[PDB]
Scaffold this motif. Structure first.
Motif, PDB file in Angstrom:
ATOM      1  N   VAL G  50     -14.622  26.359  43.194  1.00 16.87           N
ATOM      2  CA  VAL G  50     -13.283  25.818  43.021  1.00 16.87           C
ATOM      3  C   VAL G  50     -13.281  24.693  42.003  1.00 16.87           C
ATOM      4  CG1 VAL G  50     -11.350  24.840  44.227  1.00 16.87           C
ATOM      5  CG2 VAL G  50     -12.826  26.437  45.392  1.00 16.87           C
ATOM      6  N   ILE G  51     -14.333  23.891  41.999  1.00 18.28           N
ATOM      7  CA  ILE G  51     -14.430  22.781  41.077  1.00 18.28           C
ATOM      8  C   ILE G  51     -14.627  23.277  39.663  1.00 18.28           C
ATOM      9  CG2 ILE G  51     -15.787  20.790  40.529  1.00 18.28           C
ATOM     10  CD1 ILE G  51     -16.329  20.584  43.528  1.00 18.28           C
ATOM     11  N   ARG G  52     -15.414  24.330  39.484  1.00 13.45           N
ATOM     12  CA  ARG G  52     -15.600  24.847  38.140  1.00 13.45           C
ATOM     13  C   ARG G  52     -14.295  25.385  37.588  1.00 13.45           C
ATOM     14  NH1 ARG G  52     -18.114  28.842  39.689  1.00 13.45           N
ATOM     15  NH2 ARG G  52     -20.281  28.159  39.479  1.00 13.45           N
ATOM     16  N   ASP G  53     -13.521  26.050  38.435  1.00  7.29           N
ATOM     17  CA  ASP G  53     -12.237  26.552  37.969  1.00  7.29           C
ATOM     18  C   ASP G  53     -11.272  25.420  37.649  1.00  7.29           C
ATOM     19  OD1 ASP G  53     -13.444  28.968  38.548  1.00  7.29           O
ATOM     20  OD2 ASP G  53     -12.482  29.149  40.507  1.00  7.29           O
ATOM     21  N   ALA G  54     -11.228  24.395  38.493  1.00  6.46           N
ATOM     22  CA  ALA G  54     -10.326  23.284  38.223  1.00  6.46           C
ATOM     23  C   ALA G  54     -10.760  22.483  37.009  1.00  6.46           C
ATOM     24  CB  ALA G  54     -10.249  22.383  39.444  1.00  6.46           C
ATOM     25  N   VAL G  55     -12.060  22.407  36.769  1.00  5.62           N
ATOM     26  CA  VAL G  55     -12.556  21.721  35.591  1.00  5.62           C
ATOM     27  C   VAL G  55     -12.166  22.471  34.339  1.00  5.62           C
ATOM     28  CG1 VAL G  55     -14.617  20.955  34.426  1.00  5.62           C
ATOM     29  CG2 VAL G  55     -14.382  20.618  36.823  1.00  5.62           C
ATOM     30  N   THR G  56     -12.250  23.793  34.375  1.00  3.24           N
ATOM     31  CA  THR G  56     -11.802  24.555  33.222  1.00  3.24           C
ATOM     32  C   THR G  56     -10.307  24.415  33.014  1.00  3.24           C
ATOM     33  OG1 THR G  56     -11.809  26.422  34.739  1.00  3.24           O
ATOM     34  CG2 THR G  56     -13.635  26.195  33.228  1.00  3.24           C
ATOM     35  N   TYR G  57      -9.558  24.301  34.102  1.00  4.29           N
ATOM     36  CA  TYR G  57      -8.129  24.057  33.996  1.00  4.29           C
ATOM     37  C   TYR G  57      -7.838  22.739  33.297  1.00  4.29           C
ATOM     38  CZ  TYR G  57      -6.558  27.896  36.964  1.00  4.29           C
ATOM     39  OH  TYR G  57      -6.246  29.130  37.471  1.00  4.29           O
ATOM     40  N   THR G  58      -8.399  21.652  33.815  1.00  3.85           N
ATOM     41  CA  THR G  58      -8.109  20.338  33.261  1.00  3.85           C
ATOM     42  C   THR G  58      -8.771  20.116  31.917  1.00  3.85           C
ATOM     43  OG1 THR G  58      -8.144  17.976  33.757  1.00  3.85           O
ATOM     44  CG2 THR G  58     -10.053  19.309  34.373  1.00  3.85           C
ATOM     45  N   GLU G  59      -9.770  20.917  31.586  1.00  2.10           N
ATOM     46  CA  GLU G  59     -10.389  20.834  30.281  1.00  2.10           C
ATOM     47  C   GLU G  59      -9.574  21.582  29.249  1.00  2.10           C
ATOM     48  OE1 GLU G  59     -12.921  19.081  29.145  1.00  2.10           O
ATOM     49  OE2 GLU G  59     -12.482  19.946  27.177  1.00  2.10           O
ATOM     50  N   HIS G  60      -8.915  22.659  29.666  1.00  5.05           N
ATOM     51  CA  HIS G  60      -8.006  23.340  28.761  1.00  5.05           C
ATOM     52  C   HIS G  60      -6.832  22.455  28.382  1.00  5.05           C
ATOM     53  CE1 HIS G  60      -5.131  25.909  26.986  1.00  5.05           C
ATOM     54  NE2 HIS G  60      -4.447  26.155  28.087  1.00  5.05           N
ATOM     55  N   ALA G  61      -6.407  21.581  29.285  1.00  6.17           N
ATOM     56  CA  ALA G  61      -5.333  20.642  28.995  1.00  6.17           C
ATOM     57  C   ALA G  61      -5.842  19.319  28.450  1.00  6.17           C
ATOM     58  CB  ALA G  61      -4.509  20.391  30.251  1.00  6.17           C
ATOM     59  N   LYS G  62      -7.147  19.198  28.237  1.00 12.82           N
ATOM     60  CA  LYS G  62      -7.745  17.990  27.675  1.00 12.82           C
ATOM     61  C   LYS G  62      -7.464  16.758  28.531  1.00 12.82           C
ATOM     62  CE  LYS G  62      -6.501  19.920  23.169  1.00 12.82           C
ATOM     63  NZ  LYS G  62      -5.668  19.694  21.957  1.00 12.82           N
ATOM     64  N   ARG G  63      -7.488  16.927  29.847  1.00 11.65           N
ATOM     65  CA  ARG G  63      -7.276  15.827  30.776  1.00 11.65           C
ATOM     66  C   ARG G  63      -8.602  15.473  31.431  1.00 11.65           C
ATOM     67  NH1 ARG G  63      -5.059  17.149  34.875  1.00 11.65           N
ATOM     68  NH2 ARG G  63      -3.813  19.050  34.658  1.00 11.65           N
ATOM     69  N   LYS G  64      -8.926  14.183  31.447  1.00 13.39           N
ATOM     70  CA  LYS G  64     -10.196  13.740  31.996  1.00 13.39           C
ATOM     71  C   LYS G  64     -10.210  13.691  33.507  1.00 13.39           C
ATOM     72  CE  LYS G  64     -13.417  12.013  28.997  1.00 13.39           C
ATOM     73  NZ  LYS G  64     -14.856  11.688  29.210  1.00 13.39           N
ATOM     74  N   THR G  65      -9.053  13.701  34.141  1.00 14.41           N
ATOM     75  CA  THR G  65      -8.976  13.671  35.586  1.00 14.41           C
ATOM     76  C   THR G  65      -8.626  15.042  36.137  1.00 14.41           C
ATOM     77  OG1 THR G  65      -8.161  12.381  37.445  1.00 14.41           O
ATOM     78  CG2 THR G  65      -6.546  13.149  35.823  1.00 14.41           C
ATOM     79  N   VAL G  66      -8.837  15.189  37.436  1.00 18.23           N
ATOM     80  CA  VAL G  66      -8.572  16.424  38.151  1.00 18.23           C
ATOM     81  C   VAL G  66      -7.370  16.194  39.046  1.00 18.23           C
ATOM     82  CG1 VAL G  66      -9.493  18.078  39.781  1.00 18.23           C
ATOM     83  CG2 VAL G  66     -10.944  17.081  38.082  1.00 18.23           C
ATOM     84  N   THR G  67      -6.223  16.741  38.666  1.00 14.58           N
ATOM     85  CA  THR G  67      -5.051  16.572  39.499  1.00 14.58           C
ATOM     86  C   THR G  67      -5.112  17.537  40.677  1.00 14.58           C
ATOM     87  OG1 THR G  67      -2.645  16.404  39.482  1.00 14.58           O
ATOM     88  CG2 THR G  67      -3.627  18.234  38.303  1.00 14.58           C
ATOM     89  N   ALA G  68      -4.084  17.484  41.514  1.00 12.66           N
ATOM     90  CA  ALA G  68      -4.032  18.343  42.686  1.00 12.66           C
ATOM     91  C   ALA G  68      -3.598  19.755  42.326  1.00 12.66           C
ATOM     92  CB  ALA G  68      -3.082  17.745  43.712  1.00 12.66           C
ATOM     93  N   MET G  69      -2.696  19.874  41.355  1.00 11.64           N
ATOM     94  CA  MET G  69      -2.183  21.183  40.974  1.00 11.64           C
ATOM     95  C   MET G  69      -3.286  22.066  40.434  1.00 11.64           C
ATOM     96  SD  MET G  69       1.322  20.755  41.236  1.00 11.64           S
ATOM     97  CE  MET G  69       2.439  19.365  41.371  1.00 11.64           C
ATOM     98  N   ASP G  70      -4.275  21.470  39.782  1.00 12.26           N
ATOM     99  CA  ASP G  70      -5.397  22.251  39.297  1.00 12.26           C
ATOM    100  C   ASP G  70      -6.215  22.815  40.441  1.00 12.26           C
ATOM    101  OD1 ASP G  70      -4.569  21.650  36.763  1.00 12.26           O
ATOM    102  OD2 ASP G  70      -5.995  20.007  36.477  1.00 12.26           O
ATOM    103  N   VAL G  71      -6.327  22.079  41.536  1.00 14.57           N
ATOM    104  CA  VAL G  71      -7.045  22.600  42.688  1.00 14.57           C
ATOM    105  C   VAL G  71      -6.229  23.680  43.374  1.00 14.57           C
ATOM    106  CG1 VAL G  71      -8.349  21.925  44.688  1.00 14.57           C
ATOM    107  CG2 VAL G  71      -7.971  20.318  42.886  1.00 14.57           C
TER     108      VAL G  71
END
Lengths: 106, 72, 84, 95, 98, 97, 87, 95, 106, 77
Positions: G50-71
DNA sequence: CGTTAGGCATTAAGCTGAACGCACAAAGGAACAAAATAAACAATACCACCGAAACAAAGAATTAGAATAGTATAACGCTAACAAACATAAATTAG
DNA sequence: CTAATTTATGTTTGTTAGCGTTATACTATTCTAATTCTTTGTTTCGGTGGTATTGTTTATTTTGTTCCTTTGTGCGTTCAGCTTAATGCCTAACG
């Protein structure tokens, strides 16, 4: 003199057809020009990975044709293609031949 | 198209020639009723009347096995 | 061409269940497996066929193609490869 | 004068002759490869569409496809496919 | 005195030859009759393409073979080889079916 | 002394925790675990507190689903306990291995 | 007796009582001692996915933090949708 | 002067006061109902979209929604929802 | 004098917002005018079915608020709502309280 | 251990002395409820009553900047 | 069927001030957690058995295959006409 | 508490049902061929019950360990309005 977009990328899959399917598939309003080149690249690589293992399976079976038993063998024997096609079943494919070790006699 | 057809048995060639006979003597007849009558007449024939057709079918079977001996 | 059908679940026979079982690796099959497997098959076919019937009835059609069976199995999450 | 079936049948054979010149292929296995190509196209385009929607992007560029490739394809398949893709866009942009 | 095999000895050879072979193991005509029997209750007078009944037979055999694999996993887990209907209900329950 | 029978306290805790909707994982150690794993994929990854709360909630749900399936598989094998082979079977049959 | 501190090993943070409670919620009467490490590994690989998927999400948006919507979006794709944290 | 969150929070409360006047609701349960509404909207609109594509229809009308409702919702929920829907379009077309 | 489309159908959910979400959700190029009325109808009925069982659960618990424990109870106790929301888990919801009969003492 | 602590603000020293007051007047009281009540009372105080505490916190801030003028916060892992 | 040369109108990269989010200062028992232990009940090892499933041969009965004709049906093309997108003025509503 | 977001009216347009036709695969029929399903008689072996050992979980008490809830301050992250180059879609032409 003009050269096709499939061989502009040096590929086999047609860039124009995947561009047209991305347009008419109703995925977005616009689509970037690198999108079909990328998608055809990953598709061609993917079917290369399938057909290479299939040819090695059919040559391993001393056959000269690819029947879908070879495709099922090549997909189920792999690790990271089995995850891509884990839910998908294959027509006339059969199963991967494996028997539990406790069923076998000693 | 490359598809090998099944060889004719006795009743198929018999019904073929007899259905051609019925279609040259009778107009305005539906072929399902024709085949019903042909099966009826073939089951009321005596076996003494069928040996040429089964022998000819046996000739087609030996021609088929001699034409394709490694056939399965 | 009008006809009603009945008792077609006995047409899938017990030594034809044993082959589907022994493909999956089963070494011994009990006696009461057969009716339960027929019921499982019945409910699975009922779900997928109802989906296929709704698919073909949306299209204002009268026959069942194989493409609609493929879509019905896609909606259950069991994708079929080999028919388009 | 039949209308023609739009399918990926020629290009699978072209890839096969690139990768395996001696072995032939059936027709039903070619249909399986066509269905597989359409399945993977649907998966990748659906993830790219929902990614462009989650970021409120009205344009699907190669970044979304790359992210979807990293999402779906597990293991080394992901990075191999990304390397093939970036090779392809560098080929297409260099020309 | 005829020669007789043992229970299980022939079964492994059958398992091997059916895992090798890729054909369908239930006949096409009873499957046609059953599909047309079931599909009456949703809409009467439906025509079934032969390819549609074949696709249904492929997916049916795949589903039952997967279910019997899971049944064998569960029966082996309970230290049995003879599978039982409770194993089928269990393997359906775990799977998210019911 | 009057010690309870083995499992009766377990039954009371079963009914209490099933009647309860509380979070059974402490927040700080789960935060530490999440920011320890996620560094391996990318560095400098701060998390919102709602995100780690969501991860804890979903892991709670996934584990209680895994554990009811595990207890199903263990009861099926005539066992009250839980052994790791039950977890293996419940993950295999669900199609996660 | 004396407290023991172990460097890193964050999976270990998920304590043993905080797993007995998770199983008591699941309706479990007895837990053997070999369950905690296996459950730790299961939770570890689940969070890895789940973390790898959320990291790819927030990395596609160039955001350094992990929001809740990505999880939420990372859990949706594995067939386990979260309610309550926004759509 | 914050930008506003577009959500279904008021209408769930309106339905609740139509169906249950005495009992109140939390805020987090209202968020759950909003997420549930968006989930079901996504399911129904996705099936309607793929049905319009399988029939090569460029327009999603109420028939596709009705078919998707009959597809997803099991049991009596299907026919109850269809009856509610047809009541709604008869109300909307009669006016 | 003009009346809103949500009450033209005699409903609560806004027809205009679901029309806008069907447009901008990129599901088709066109969308029929009966589609949002139908979708709002089935949605409003669906949340009516949720909230009615939730209110009966909360009144059954002698509470006056709907906490998500009541939503989880109302969904998991049902049969045909459990099939709709079988994979979905609920935030702070807990489980349906049920204990296997062999674990319980005699 | 060499770790530089954060300087106290107004509410921490206020709650410190007032929690010591409550613990010398009240036995058998849990500290979470104490801190809840202390936050409640600090939010019902008028701003006219807090200027000594914020001024003392400002004295600690100027003492901190005069004690470490080249100081910058550095979060580590 | 597939590719390519110029507008133009939409769209993502670039930039900055501002608002958000998080950690952390004291507190101090409360609530939790690790560790050691008694023992009690659950897992398991072993044994008997018996009826239940496998194996086999025979025949029956069913499916397969093919020729064939009807034949409902589905898949092609024109055509209207209808329904939906779009440009532009209220209103109510709601965060 | 008033901007903003749904609703209404007329216009274009482009989608779709109606219609005709026809082809085409579907359904039914009747034959042989073959093959396989069901019956009936062995036979042998695995699920299940019953008992005994053991091994390990639980419940508990003691002693650390942490946590938790409170507001203000510092700092890093994100985001939104505004600029601006990038680019993809449409048309016309060509192969």
């Amino acid at each position: 003199k003009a050269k096709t977009r499939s061989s502009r990328a040096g590929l086999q899959f047609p860039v124009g057809r995947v561009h047209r399917l991305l347009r008419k598939g109703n995925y977005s309003e616009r689509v970037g020009a690198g999108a079909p080149v990328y998608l055809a690249a990953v598709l061609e690589y993917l079917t290369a990975e399938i057909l290479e293992l299939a040819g090695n399976a059919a040559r391993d079976n001393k056959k000269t044709r690819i029947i879908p038993r070879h495709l099922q063998l090549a997909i189920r024997n792999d690790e990271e293609l089995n995850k891509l096609l884990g839910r998908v079943t294959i027509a006339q494919g059969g199963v991967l031949p494996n028997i539990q070790a406790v069923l076998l006699p000693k | 198209s490359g598809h090998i057809k099944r060889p004719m048995n006795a009743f198929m060639v018999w019904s073929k020639i007899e259905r051609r006979k019925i279609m040259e003597q009778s107009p305005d007849m539906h072929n399902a009723e024709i085949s019903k009558r042909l099966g009826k007449r073939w089951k009321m024939l005596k076996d003494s009347e069928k040996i040429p057709f089964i022998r000819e079918a046996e000739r087609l079977r030996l021609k088929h096995m001699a034409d394709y001996p490694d056939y399965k | 061409h009008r006809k009603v059908l009945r008792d077609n679940i006995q047409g899938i026979t017990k030594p034809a269940i044993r082959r589907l079982a022994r493909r999956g690796g089963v070494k011994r099959i009990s006696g009461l497996i057969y009716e339960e497997t027929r019921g499982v098959l019945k409910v699975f076919l009922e779900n997928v066929i109802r989906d296929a019937v709704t698919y073909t009835e949306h299209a204002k059609r009268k026959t069942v193609t194989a493409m609609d069976v493929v879509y019905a199995l896609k909606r259950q999450g069991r994708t079929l490869y080999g028919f388009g | 004068k039949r209308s023609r079936k739009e399918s990926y049948s020629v290009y699978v054979y072209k890839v096969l002759k690139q990768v395996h010149p001696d072995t032939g292929i059936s027709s039903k296995a070619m249909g399986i490869m066509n269905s597989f190509v359409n399945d993977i196209f649907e998966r990748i385009a659906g993830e790219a569409s929902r990614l462009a929607h989650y970021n409120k992007r009205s344009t699907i560029t190669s970044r979304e496809i790359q992210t979807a490739v990293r999402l779906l394809l597990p293991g080394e398949l992901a990075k191999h496919a990304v390397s093939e893709g970036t090779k392809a866009v560098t080929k297409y942009t260099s020309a | 005195k005829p020669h007789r095999y043992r229970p299980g000895t022939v079964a492994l050879r059958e398992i091997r030859r059916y895992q090798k072979s890729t054909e369908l193991l239930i006949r096409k005509l009873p499957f046609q009759r059953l599909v047309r029997e079931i599909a009456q209750d949703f809409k009467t007078d439906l025509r079934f393409q032969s390819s549609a009944v074949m696709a249904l037979q492929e997916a049916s055999e795949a589903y039952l073979v997967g279910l019997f694999e899971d049944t064998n996993l569960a029966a082996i887990h309970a230290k049995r080889v003879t599978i039982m209907p409770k194993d089928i209900q269990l393997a359906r329950r775990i799977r998210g079916e019911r």
